[PDB]
Amino acid sequence: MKTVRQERLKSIVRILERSKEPVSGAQLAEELSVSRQVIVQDIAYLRSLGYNIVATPRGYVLAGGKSGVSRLVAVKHAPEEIKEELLCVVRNGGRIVDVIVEHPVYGEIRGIIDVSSEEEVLKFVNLMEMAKTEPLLTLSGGVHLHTIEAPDEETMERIMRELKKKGFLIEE
Ligand SMILES: [K+]
Ligand code: NI
Numbered sequence: 543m544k545t546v547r548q549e550r551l552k553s554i555v556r557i558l559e560r561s562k563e564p565v566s567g568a569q570l571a572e573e574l575s576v577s578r579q580v581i582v583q584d585i586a587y588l589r590s591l592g593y594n595i596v597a598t599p600r601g602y603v604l605a606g607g608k609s610g611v612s613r614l615v616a617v618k619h620a621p622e623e624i625k626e627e628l629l630c631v632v633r634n635g636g637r638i639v640d641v642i643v644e645h646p647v648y649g650e651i652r653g654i655i656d657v658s659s660e661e662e663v664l665k666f667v668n669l670m671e672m673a674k675t676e677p678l679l680t681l682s683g684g685v686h687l688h689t690i691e692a693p694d695e696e697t698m699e700r701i702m703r704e705l706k707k708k709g710f711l712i713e714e
Pocket of ligand 1 (some may be wrong): 603
């Protein structure tokens with residue numbers, strides 16, 4: 543059944559994310575009441591969808607901390623909307639890893655953001671406002687990319703929906 547499987551896949555992702563240590567396929571099989579082989583197939587499927595799962599000798603590993611899935615998002619906004627954009631992403635369950643923006647000298651520059659909570663967003667903005675350099679998001683008409691991570695596709699989808707509602711997304 544399609545629904546039975548969607549439920550098992552969601553559980554696998556949650557179990558792997560919650561766990562600090564690797565979780566063996568035998569344990570996932572025991573915990574989900576399916577054969578070891580069903581787990582091998584589920585994991586291959588989850589990976590082809592984008593889940594950053596790795597099979598190590600001691601078990602499957604999938605980073606908790608909202609880093610299950612990753613995606614490049616094309617957005618467009620002024621430097622003053624940075625806070626709004628980050629809050630929109632962290633409040634919806636994800637994290638912003640970095641920013642890529644075209645530059646007239648270096649082709650493109652990649653900067654680090656690394657925020658996954660409202661407090662980190664506020665520390666980033668505060669930190670940014672206290673600094674005295676030229677803004678980067680003034681470059682390229684405000685067009686830039688962000689690598690966004692999320693616990694799962696459902697969450698990633700919610701994040702894209704919200705960014706769209708705020709008019710940040712570039713769509714063509
Ligand atoms: K984990
Ligand atoms: Ni941005």
